[PDB]
Write an enzyme that holds these catalytic residues in place. Sequence first.
Site, PDB file in Angstrom:
ATOM      1  N   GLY B   9       0.631  -1.233   0.216  1.00  0.00           N
ATOM      2  CA  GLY B   9       0.032  -0.128  -0.018  1.00  0.00           C
ATOM      3  C   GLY B   9       1.097   0.942   0.050  1.00  0.00           C
ATOM      4  N   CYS B  10      -0.334   2.386   0.014  1.00  0.00           N
ATOM      5  CA  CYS B  10       0.807   3.837   0.477  1.00  0.00           C
ATOM      6  C   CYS B  10       2.638   3.709   1.072  1.00  0.00           C
ATOM      7  CB  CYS B  10      -0.506   4.791   0.983  1.00  0.00           C
ATOM      8  SG  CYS B  10       0.754   6.335   0.592  1.00  0.00           S
ATOM      9  N   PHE B  11       3.527   3.959   0.286  1.00  0.00           N
ATOM     10  CA  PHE B  11       4.955   3.173   1.117  1.00  0.00           C
ATOM     11  C   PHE B  11       4.725   4.645   2.814  1.00  0.00           C
ATOM     12  CE2 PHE B  11       7.274   5.454  -2.486  1.00  0.00           C
ATOM     13  CZ  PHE B  11       6.913   6.617  -2.593  1.00  0.00           C
ATOM     14  N   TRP B  12       4.633   5.522   2.205  1.00  0.00           N
ATOM     15  CA  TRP B  12       4.317   5.929   3.531  1.00  0.00           C
ATOM     16  C   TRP B  12       4.001   5.143   4.787  1.00  0.00           C
ATOM     17  CZ3 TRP B  12       0.936  10.910   1.767  1.00  0.00           C
ATOM     18  CH2 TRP B  12       1.324  12.027   1.010  1.00  0.00           C
TER      19      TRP B  12
END
EC number: 1.8.4.11
Lengths: 164, 164
Positions: B9-12
């Site tokens: 998913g979103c890497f953040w």
Amino acid sequence: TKRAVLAGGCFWGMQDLIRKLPGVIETRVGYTGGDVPNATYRNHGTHAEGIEIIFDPERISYRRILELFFQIHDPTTKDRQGNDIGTSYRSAIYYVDDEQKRIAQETIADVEASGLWPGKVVTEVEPVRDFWEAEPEHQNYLERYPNGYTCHFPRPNWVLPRRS
Amino acid sequence: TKRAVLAGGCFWGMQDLIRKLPGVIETRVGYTGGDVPNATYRNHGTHAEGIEIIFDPERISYRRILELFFQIHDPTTKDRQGNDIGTSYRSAIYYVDDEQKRIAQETIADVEASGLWPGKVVTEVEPVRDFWEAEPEHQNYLERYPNGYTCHFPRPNWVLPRRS
Ligand SMILES: [Ca+2]
Ligand SMILES: [Cl-]
């Protein structure tokens, strides 16, 4: 993996250059070597701005890290690095164990014996104590701002014979 | 030291949680598992947003890293993680060697055998290929912006028996 802890001026420039050494896994900047707990950028008492370096000893030695350290900052100016004046900017090696102490002492002796640096080495050699990580804005600063402030650079003349 | 490479998913949000696992030395986010060289945030073709994790195997195992991975993202939604839709957000394990492949396969089998997750695991298992590091602004994003966007969180119900 192994840990090295160093101080040699504004920590942005320290991290910018040391992070590039092959075998260095992680770097983080912070305040260390001084008095006050919970140190911050504007409130860190007698701490130096410093850097913690986690490295792979199979790929890079502590000695090689110290050699880059002595290449990229002037270790002869007490409580000053370039334009940055004060105890925050002093030169120091914070050894994590006896082997690092011995290598630090040997390396300083080699530095002085060479006569290549501009005066006696004033770098402190002390056991590592608390390392207060700097605020997120300071981490990787010159990655986010590649044209940002630095007075660090590698002097080609500040190198030792590589006897090994 | 050892390397793990994951996408979920979103890497953040991936970095925000995985960086906290004791024994993880460094994390960096980037684009991997896809087609185009020199990948960037707005131009990465079929790459997933992913994370590279350097860890100390004496302190933390690859298996434990995978267990956190399966705890913090839903591995059952194809080409989607929470609000983030697309192949950029897919679940994948990029093994660096045969041992990691075997542990990934065993771990997915354990995940499914438990019946605790919401459907079949769709996580890809592939050899690691080029990892295109993301732009500096993406690195450590949720350190600089601790209230920033994330759809990752550890589900207490998405845990396996610790037979070892
Ligand atoms: Ca880092
Ligand atoms: Cl950063």
